[PDB]
PDB file of C-alpha atoms (C1' of nucleotides) in Angstrom:
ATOM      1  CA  UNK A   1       0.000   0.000   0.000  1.00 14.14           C
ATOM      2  CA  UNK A   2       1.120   3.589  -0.153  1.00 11.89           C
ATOM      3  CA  UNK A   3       0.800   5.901   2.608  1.00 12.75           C
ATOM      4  CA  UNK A   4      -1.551   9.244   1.061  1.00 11.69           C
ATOM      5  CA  UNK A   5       0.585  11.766   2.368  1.00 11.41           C
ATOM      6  CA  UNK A   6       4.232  12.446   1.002  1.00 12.82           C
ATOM      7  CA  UNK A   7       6.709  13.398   3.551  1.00 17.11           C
ATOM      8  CA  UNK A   8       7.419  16.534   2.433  1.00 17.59           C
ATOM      9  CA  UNK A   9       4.165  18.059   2.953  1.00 15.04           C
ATOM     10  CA  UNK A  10       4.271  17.026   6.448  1.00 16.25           C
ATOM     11  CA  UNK A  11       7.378  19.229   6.804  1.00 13.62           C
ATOM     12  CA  UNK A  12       6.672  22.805   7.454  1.00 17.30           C
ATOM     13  CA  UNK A  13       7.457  25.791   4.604  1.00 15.31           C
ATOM     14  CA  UNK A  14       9.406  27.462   7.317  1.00 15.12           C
ATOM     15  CA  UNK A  15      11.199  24.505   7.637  1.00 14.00           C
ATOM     16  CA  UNK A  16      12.134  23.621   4.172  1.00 14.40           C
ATOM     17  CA  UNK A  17      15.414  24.361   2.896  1.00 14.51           C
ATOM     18  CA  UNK A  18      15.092  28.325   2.194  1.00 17.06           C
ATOM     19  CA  UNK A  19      14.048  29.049  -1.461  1.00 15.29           C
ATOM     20  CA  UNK A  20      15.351  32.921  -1.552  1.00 14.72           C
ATOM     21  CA  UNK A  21      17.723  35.589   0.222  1.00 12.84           C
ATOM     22  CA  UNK A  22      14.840  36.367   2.711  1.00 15.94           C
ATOM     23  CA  UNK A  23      14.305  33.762   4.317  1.00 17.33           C
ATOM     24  CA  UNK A  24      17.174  32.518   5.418  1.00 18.59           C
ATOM     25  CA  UNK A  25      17.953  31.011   8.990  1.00 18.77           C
ATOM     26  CA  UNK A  26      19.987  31.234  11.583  1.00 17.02           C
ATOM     27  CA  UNK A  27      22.013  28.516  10.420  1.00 14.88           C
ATOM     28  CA  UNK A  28      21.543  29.654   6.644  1.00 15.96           C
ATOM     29  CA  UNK A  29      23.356  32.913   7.720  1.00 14.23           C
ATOM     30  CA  UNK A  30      26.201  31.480   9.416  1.00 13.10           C
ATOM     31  CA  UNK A  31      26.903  28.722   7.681  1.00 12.57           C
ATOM     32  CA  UNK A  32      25.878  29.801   4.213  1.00 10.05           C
ATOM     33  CA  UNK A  33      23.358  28.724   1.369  1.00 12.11           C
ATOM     34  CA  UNK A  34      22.745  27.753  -2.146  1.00 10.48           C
ATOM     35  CA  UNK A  35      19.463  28.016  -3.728  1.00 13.83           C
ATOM     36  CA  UNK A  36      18.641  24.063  -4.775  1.00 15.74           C
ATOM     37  CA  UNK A  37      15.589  24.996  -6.946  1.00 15.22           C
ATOM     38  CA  UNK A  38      17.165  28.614  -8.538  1.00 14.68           C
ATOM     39  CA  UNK A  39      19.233  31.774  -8.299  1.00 19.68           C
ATOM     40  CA  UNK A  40      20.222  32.442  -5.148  1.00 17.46           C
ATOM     41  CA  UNK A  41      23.512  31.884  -2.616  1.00 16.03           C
ATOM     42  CA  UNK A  42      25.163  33.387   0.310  1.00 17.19           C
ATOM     43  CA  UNK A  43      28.900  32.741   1.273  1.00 16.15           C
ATOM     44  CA  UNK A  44      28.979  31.218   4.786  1.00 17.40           C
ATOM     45  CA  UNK A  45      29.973  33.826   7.866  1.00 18.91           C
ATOM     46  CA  UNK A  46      32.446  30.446   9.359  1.00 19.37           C
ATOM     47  CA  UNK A  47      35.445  29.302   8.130  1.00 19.66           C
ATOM     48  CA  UNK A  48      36.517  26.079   9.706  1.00 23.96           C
ATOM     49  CA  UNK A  49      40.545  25.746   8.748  1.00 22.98           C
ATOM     50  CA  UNK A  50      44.088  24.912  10.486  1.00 26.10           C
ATOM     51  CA  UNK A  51      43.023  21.302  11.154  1.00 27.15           C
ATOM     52  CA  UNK A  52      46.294  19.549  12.918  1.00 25.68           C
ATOM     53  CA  UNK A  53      46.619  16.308  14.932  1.00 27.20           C
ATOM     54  CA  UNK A  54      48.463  16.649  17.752  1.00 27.67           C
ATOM     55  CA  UNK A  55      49.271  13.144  17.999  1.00 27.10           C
ATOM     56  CA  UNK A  56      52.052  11.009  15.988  1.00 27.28           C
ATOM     57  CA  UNK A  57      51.076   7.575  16.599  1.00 28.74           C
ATOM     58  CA  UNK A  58      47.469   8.326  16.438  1.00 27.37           C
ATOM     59  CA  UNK A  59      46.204   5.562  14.518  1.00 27.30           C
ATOM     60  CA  UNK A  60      45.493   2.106  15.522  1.00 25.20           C
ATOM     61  CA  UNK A  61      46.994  -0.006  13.710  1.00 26.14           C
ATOM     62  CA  UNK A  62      45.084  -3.781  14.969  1.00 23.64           C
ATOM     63  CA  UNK A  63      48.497  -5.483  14.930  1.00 20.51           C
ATOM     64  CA  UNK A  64      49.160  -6.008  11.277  1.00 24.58           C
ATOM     65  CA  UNK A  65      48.712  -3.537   8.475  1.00 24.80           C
ATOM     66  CA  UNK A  66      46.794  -6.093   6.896  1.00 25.04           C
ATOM     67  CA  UNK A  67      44.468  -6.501   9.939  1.00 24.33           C
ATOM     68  CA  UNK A  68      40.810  -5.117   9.317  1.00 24.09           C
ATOM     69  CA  UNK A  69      37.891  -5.694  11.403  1.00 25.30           C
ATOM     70  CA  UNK A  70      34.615  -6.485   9.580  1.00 26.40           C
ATOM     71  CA  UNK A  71      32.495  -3.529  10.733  1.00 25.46           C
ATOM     72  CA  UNK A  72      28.859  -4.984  11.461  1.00 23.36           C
ATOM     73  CA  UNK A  73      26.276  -3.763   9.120  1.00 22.59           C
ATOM     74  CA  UNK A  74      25.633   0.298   8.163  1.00 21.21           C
ATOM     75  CA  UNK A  75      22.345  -0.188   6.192  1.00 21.05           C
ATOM     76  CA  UNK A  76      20.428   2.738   4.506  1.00 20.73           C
ATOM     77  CA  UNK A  77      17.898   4.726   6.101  1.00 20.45           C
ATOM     78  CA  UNK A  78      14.363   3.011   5.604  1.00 18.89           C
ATOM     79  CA  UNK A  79      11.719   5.486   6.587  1.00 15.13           C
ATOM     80  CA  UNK A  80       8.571   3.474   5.406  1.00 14.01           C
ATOM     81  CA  UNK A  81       8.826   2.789   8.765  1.00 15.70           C
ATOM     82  CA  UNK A  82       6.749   5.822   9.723  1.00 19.02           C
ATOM     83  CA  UNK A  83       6.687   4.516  13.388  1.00 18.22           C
ATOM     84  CA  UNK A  84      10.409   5.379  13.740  1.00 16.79           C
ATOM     85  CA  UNK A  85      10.008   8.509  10.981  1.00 17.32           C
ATOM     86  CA  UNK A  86       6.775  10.146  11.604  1.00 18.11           C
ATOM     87  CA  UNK A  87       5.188  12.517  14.360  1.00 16.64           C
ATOM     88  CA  UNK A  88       1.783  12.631  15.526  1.00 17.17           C
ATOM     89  CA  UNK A  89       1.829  16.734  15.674  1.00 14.05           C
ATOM     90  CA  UNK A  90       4.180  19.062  13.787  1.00 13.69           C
ATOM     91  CA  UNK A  91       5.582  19.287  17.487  1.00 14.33           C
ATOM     92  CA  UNK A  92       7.411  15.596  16.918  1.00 13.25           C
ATOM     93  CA  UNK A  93       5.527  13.846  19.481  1.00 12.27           C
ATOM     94  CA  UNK A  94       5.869  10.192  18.466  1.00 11.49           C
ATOM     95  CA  UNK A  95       3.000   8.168  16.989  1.00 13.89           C
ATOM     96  CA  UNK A  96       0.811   6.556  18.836  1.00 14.47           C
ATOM     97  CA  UNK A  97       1.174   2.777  20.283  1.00 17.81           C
ATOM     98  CA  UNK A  98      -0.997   0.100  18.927  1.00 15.19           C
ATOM     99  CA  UNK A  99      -2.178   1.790  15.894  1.00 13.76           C
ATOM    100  CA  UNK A 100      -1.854   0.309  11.911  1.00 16.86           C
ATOM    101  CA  UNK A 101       0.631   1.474  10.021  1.00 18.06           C
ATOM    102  CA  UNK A 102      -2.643   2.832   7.624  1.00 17.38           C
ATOM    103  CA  UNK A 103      -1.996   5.151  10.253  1.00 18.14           C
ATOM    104  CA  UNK A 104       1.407   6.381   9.536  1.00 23.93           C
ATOM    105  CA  UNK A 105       1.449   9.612   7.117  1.00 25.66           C
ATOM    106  CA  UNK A 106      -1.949   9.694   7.444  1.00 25.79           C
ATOM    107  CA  UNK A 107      -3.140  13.413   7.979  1.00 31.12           C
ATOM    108  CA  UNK A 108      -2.082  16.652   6.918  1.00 32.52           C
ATOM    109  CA  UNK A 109      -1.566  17.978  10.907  1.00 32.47           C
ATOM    110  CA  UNK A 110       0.700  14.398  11.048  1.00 33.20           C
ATOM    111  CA  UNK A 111       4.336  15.839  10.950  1.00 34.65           C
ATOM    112  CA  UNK A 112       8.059  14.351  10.863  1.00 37.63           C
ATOM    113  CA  UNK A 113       9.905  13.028  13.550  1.00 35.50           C
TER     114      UNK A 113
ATOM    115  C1'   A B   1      43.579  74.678 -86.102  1.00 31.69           C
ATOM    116  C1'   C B   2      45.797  69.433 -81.539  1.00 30.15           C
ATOM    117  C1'   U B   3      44.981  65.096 -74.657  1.00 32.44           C
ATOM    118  C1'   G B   4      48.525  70.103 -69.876  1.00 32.18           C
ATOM    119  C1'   A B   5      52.515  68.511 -66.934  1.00 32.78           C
ATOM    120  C1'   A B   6      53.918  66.921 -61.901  1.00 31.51           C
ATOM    121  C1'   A B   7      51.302  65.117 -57.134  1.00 28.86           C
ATOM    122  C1'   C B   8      51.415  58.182 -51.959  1.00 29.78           C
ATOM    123  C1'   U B   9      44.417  59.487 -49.085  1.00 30.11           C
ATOM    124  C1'   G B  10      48.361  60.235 -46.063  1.00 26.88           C
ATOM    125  C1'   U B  11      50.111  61.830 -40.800  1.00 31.29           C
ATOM    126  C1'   A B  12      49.494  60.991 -34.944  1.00 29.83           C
ATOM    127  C1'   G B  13      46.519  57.246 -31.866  1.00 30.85           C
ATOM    128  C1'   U B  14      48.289  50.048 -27.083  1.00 31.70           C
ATOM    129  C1'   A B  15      40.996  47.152 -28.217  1.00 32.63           C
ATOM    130  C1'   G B  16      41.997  49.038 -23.463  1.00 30.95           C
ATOM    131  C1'   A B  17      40.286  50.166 -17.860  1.00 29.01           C
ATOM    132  C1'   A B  18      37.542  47.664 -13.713  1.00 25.80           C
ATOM    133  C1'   C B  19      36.136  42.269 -12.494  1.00 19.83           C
ATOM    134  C1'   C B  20      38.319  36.021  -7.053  1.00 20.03           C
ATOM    135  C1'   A B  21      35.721  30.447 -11.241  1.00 18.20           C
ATOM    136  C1'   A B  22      32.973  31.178  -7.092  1.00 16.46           C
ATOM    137  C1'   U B  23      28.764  29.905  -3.358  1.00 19.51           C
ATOM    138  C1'   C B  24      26.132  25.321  -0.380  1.00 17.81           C
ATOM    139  C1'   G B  25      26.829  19.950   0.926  1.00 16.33           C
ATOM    140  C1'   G B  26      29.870  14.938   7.593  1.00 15.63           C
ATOM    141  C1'   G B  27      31.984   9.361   2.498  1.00 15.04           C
ATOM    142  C1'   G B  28      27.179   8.531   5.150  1.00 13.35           C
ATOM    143  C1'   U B  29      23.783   4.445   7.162  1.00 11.59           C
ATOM    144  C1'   C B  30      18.514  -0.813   9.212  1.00 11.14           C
ATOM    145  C1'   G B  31      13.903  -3.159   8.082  1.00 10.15           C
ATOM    146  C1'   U B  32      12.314  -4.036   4.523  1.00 10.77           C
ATOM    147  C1'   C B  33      10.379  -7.565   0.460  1.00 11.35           C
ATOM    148  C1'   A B  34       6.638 -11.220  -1.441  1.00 11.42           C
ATOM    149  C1'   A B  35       0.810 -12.986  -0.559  1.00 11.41           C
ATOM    150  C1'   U B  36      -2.126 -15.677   0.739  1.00  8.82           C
ATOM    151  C1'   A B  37      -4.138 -20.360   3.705  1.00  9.23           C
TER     152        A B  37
END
RNA sequence: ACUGAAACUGUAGUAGAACCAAUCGGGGUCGUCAAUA
């Protein structure tokens, strides 16, 4: 089945990434913007630079530089899973318990997590 | 009912002045998929 509601209407316009020079955020300002959808960019207000370990033998080498441990699984981001993904108010309270997942991105005033 | 002759379109003049190839982005991470008996 598919959910009737696409996740980004449950997102807030004031949330959205910023769409001109106006509106941009806090973070927009400081960190700086590009328009994804048109003209539009601002050159970030911080500069991260000078990056130096202190260290010399930081790394850990396991024993042999051949060594490598298998590193569990990383798997992608599934949010079909609107329990985990999706908010009962535009707040972010967490869905309900013991509902169907019909439920999930069910109404407009539903939000994300 | 006696052709005028002779005469460099030439001389001087910098396609140049100003202009940032640049703005934003963690090499990152979990539950899905199939429909019946």
């Amino acid at each position: 089945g598919l959910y009737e509601i696409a996740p980004v209407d449950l997102l807030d316009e004031t949330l959205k990434p910023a769409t001109d020079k106006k509106q941009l955020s806090p973070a927009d300002r400081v960190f700086g913007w590009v328009n994804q959808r048109g003209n539009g960019c601002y050159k970030g207000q911080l500069r991260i630079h000078s990056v130096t370990c202190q260290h010399d033998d930081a790394i850990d080498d396991f024993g042999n530089q051949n060594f490598s441990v298998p590193l569990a699984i990383l798997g992608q981001p599934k949010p079909e899973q609107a329990r985990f993904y999706c908010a009962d108010d535009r707040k972010g309270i967490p869905l309900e318990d013991g509902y169907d997942r019909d439920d999930g991105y069910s109404d407009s005033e539903q939000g994300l997590r």
